[PDB]
């Protein structure tokens, strides 16, 4: 990935 940050806006 690493892909999209998996934490809220």
């Amino acid at each position, epitope marked *: *990935l*690493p892909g*999209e*940050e998996d934490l*809220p*806006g």
Partner: antibody
Amino acid sequence: EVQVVESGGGLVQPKGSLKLSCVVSGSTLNNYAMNWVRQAPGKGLEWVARIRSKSNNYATYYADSVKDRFTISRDDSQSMIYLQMNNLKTEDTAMYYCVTYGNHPFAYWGQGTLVTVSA
Amino acid sequence: DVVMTQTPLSLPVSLGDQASISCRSSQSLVHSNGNTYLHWYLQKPGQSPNLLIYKVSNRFSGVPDRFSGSGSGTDFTLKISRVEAEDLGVYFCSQSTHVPFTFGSGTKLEIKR
């Protein structure tokens, strides 16, 4: 596989400055957050700074212990991350790791870059 | 400063036995969005930490099924079902629900004799 590599570490005098760099390879775009985490000799992990993606307005966050001595940034046209450290203290002596935060928390680490702050 | 308290700080183990490590937060790690951003890392001597478990109970790719995470709110446990020599090192719990991101002190898994 995503690869992370930090650089710029070395010997700096107290009150001095130091810029650390980081490159992420084998990654898809720049839509993830990047962090710096440090580890003083024989001590635990200390989160230092966070810079979010463009989509998250490149928002930055710092540990209170380094706030307004350290500044973090990023150049996505080269997938580079930077940590500028000012007014270094002997207590800033640590291994400094660049760490990804995409889908998985602190998933991909560099081998670290060593910063020794000493006279 | 969400304080992450790990128990014990030193854990003697016999190889082949189960091990459990406690991690407690000073406040709830449950976000408004329903997620709980609590994670576990293993650090072997002279190495960068490796992610084991993220969001309480999700095993990271490549991590053996002998590692499992559980808990809720402020109270979390990592279990290793049959400890191997490869498993020896320092375990860190991590929260990322709250900024500043914080880490537990580390629990060192060592050989009982």
